[PDB]
């Protein structure tokens, strides 16, 4: 019954010319709802879900202003970090930032988080209590001390425990028809011979939301991981997700095998067996 609102920011320097490429995306759970791309002509935060199009011009003006400010921070950071790390001006580098808040089933603040990476590695993060920082290396210790002096954690916590949660609750209600609906996986099994004496059984989970799922094969009631294969969970493109898991078995012994599906949209896990 918990939900999250999360923002993802990526800035990539362009050493040959110009300012960094900056992309921001916002999500509720596994649903993207807004974006900003510095390479787009609008230079505005833009809607990506129908329920956020309910918001009026003042929303779009404020989100645009704030996200452009985030872009400038990252631009400064890329220059600073090049100096912290004694790097050349010739390479392209990347800053990534993710932050967000969760509410529980009681619709109250549950947890917050704020993470920052440089060149795809941890740089600095808020600790779980939202009151102190984890610095990954000695460069990040500079940042930690600067941020402690300027009481940055308290400022972030104010948003994560306050405004952040208020937005999430507004979005959940406005987008209830989708954001608060679970789509249980549509499941089925296929069978095909791989020889005159063996067959593959493939268990499919389709059209499910949210993305978290578990598919497990069993033989005579116990977990079977040998002779199995799978794919990583993947987006269908319509907002739902897909996954499959397969096992090779002796022909004629199919009935020994069961595929077990766990998903939050299922009141109890499903068990599938071939004919």
């Amino acid at each position: 019954g918990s939900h999250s609102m999360r923002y993802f920011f990526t800035s990539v320097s362009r050493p040959g010319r110009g300012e960094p490429r900056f992309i921001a995306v916002g999500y509720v759970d596994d649903t993207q709802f807004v974006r900003f791309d510095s390479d787009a002509a609008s230079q505005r935060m833009e809607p990506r879900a129908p329920w956020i199009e309910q918001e009026g011009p003042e929303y779009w003006d404020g989100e645009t202003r704030k996200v452009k400010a985030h872009s400038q921070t990252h631009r400064v950071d890329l220059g600073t970090l090049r100096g912290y790390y004694n790097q050349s001006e010739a390479g392209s580098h990347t800053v990534q930032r993710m932050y967000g808040c969760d509410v529980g089933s009681d619709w109250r603040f549950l947890r917050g988080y704020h993470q920052y990476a440089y060149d795809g590695k941890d740089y600095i993060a808020l600790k779980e209590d939202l009151r102190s920082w984890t610095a990954a290396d000695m460069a990040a210790q500079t940042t930690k001390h600067k941020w402690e002096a300027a009481h940055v954690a308290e400022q972030l916590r104010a948003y994560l425990e306050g405004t952040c949660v208020e937005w999430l609750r507004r979005y959940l209600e406005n987008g209830k028809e989708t954001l608060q609906r679970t789509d249980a996986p549509k499941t089925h099994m296929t069978h095909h011979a791989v020889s005159d004496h063996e067959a593959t059984l493939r268990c499919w989970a389709l059209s499910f939301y949210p993305a978290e799922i578990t598919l497990t094969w069993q033989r005579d009631g116990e977990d079977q991981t040998q002779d199995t294969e799978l794919v990583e969970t993947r987006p269908a493109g319509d907002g739902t997700f897909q996954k499959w898991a397969a096992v090779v078995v002796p022909s004629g012994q199919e009935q020994r095998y069961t595929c077990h599906v766990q998903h939050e949209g299922l009141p109890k896990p499903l068990t599938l067996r071939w004919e």
């Binding site: 921001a24 916002g26 989100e63 985030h70 932050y99 940042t143 400022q155 972030l156 104010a158 405004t163």
Partner: peptide
């Protein structure tokens, strides 16, 4: 809605 407080650089 995005963070609405003061921005801080590394």
């Amino acid at each position: 809605g995005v963070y609405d407080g003061r921005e801080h650089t590394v």
